[PDB]
Amino acid sequence: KRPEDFKFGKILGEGSFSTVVLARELATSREYAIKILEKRHIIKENKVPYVTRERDVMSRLDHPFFVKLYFTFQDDEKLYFGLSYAKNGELLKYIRKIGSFDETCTRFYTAEIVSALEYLHGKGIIHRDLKPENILLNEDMHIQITDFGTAKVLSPESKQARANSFVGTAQYVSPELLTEKSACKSSDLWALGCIIYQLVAGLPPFRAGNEGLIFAKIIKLEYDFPEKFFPKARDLVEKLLVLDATKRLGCEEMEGYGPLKAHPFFESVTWENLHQQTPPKL
Template identity: 25%
Template sequence: MSITAWTDEDVRAALVPQNEFPPCSYLRGTRLGRGACASVYKVLNVKTGGLFAGKSSPQAADHLREEARNLTRLNHPQIVKFIEYSEDKHNPAANVLVMELCAGGSLQDRIHDNSKGLNGQDTLRVLLQIGQAVEYLHGQGLFHTDIKPRNIVARSWAPVNVVLGDCAEVMKVQHIDPRKRPYGTRSYWSPYMEKHSRNSGKSDDIWALGISLLGMMAQWPRCLIKQEKLYPKKCYNHAHELHKLNLGDDRTQILLRLLVWDHNKRITAPQLVKLTAERLEAGPNFVEELKSPEGFQPLVFW
């Protein structure tokens, strides 16, 4: 399936009745991805011929509307670009959030396709660019709440050009409600979130970047059902063992800074951007092949 062209497959998909798609200037083509409550499609602007990504959420219209509102307020080159939002005023479940089309797919897809992990240079470039997006958010008094490889998409991989997406739950740090369950995906929760069952704020994003870095290195420990509460400690211990086995590798050194247990001592987004940029400029050091702790079994994607 070609992402960058409107194909015969898209033409056929556009002919299928689409009650959950609003009357607008776009045709809905093939589905590019699906999440818990939304699907993303290739969409064609019939007036300009431009291709974009269209996200529809019939079951969670309010959530999609909030994401559209958030994107209109955000302006950074490493945050996915908002194009427009449309919904049927008589049927809000028929909706579409139109965004730039990122032809490289998600970071999650990239991890799936590279069983030994991304190469070191690409890994640091992803960290730098998403770090820049996070630095921007944190500078606005905001935090993302759900950073993970599935929410990082690539305009291209050669050269690396990635953006942070899924901004529906971006929120102000001052608006954290201590009575509410933490936002975000459970396996990316920080130790503070697991202990207190609430968000901490900016440091939550930093921990999630650390878990994402483990994924880029093909070093995700298994997260067992009903043992999710133990997962932060499992990742923390794994990171320290990795570092001991791969001394001198810049990825493991950055990993330790991201996965500091005490959220008050964790590296900040500006510090991460500075550190990663310096390593890339100086010529980073990577071991030829990462050594994993004894008994480690990486996640396998089918």
């Protein structure tokens, strides 16, 4: 494909070295979110690892709750990644707007994230930057998870469990990354715990005016629940926000996703056809 194969529209996101722009493919009339990277910039900033990594990770993804990579092309100066377009924006936008999700909405969107992570972890991949800003909503209001630049493919051949790069967003970073200096699949489950808490409480659990203060609270597991927090959701959060990464519900050591999906908070959930169910109105 060539850039001339598309008509570009509004900018969907501006990054430090890349931009995402809405595009319509002329020959088919389909809409894509195209991620564009300046080739000169990548070499200068040594962002190539982030770029090559992202292509290979996304090439492995084929699940309804993840952004799909449809095509990639290049011209003398730029790299283009054709991605799924999610019309309804970030999950964060809705948390801020509504303030906090009711129990039905909390359960439904938490279940979709759990289903997504079960797939991703099954493929041996750690997102490492899960947060509401990276959980988009498509036209039907189902989730689409994006931003795989920070993602890691763990090697099957050495039964790899740990990733060493320090990446992520402070409010959602796991204690093991801060103290042991490495992350694992279970690090995404810590982030899930923060996200569930945020859907109900309106803000993430560890929050402060700067990163260092946040890190200090994470390491000490210093947070509180607001009054009226749904009880079964509270129990689930307490089973995810655990300092020991081998003791989080859903992690390999705790025998995987089955026990997590079996949590009482999810009792009314039908897991199989989640992506075809009608989302509860927010």
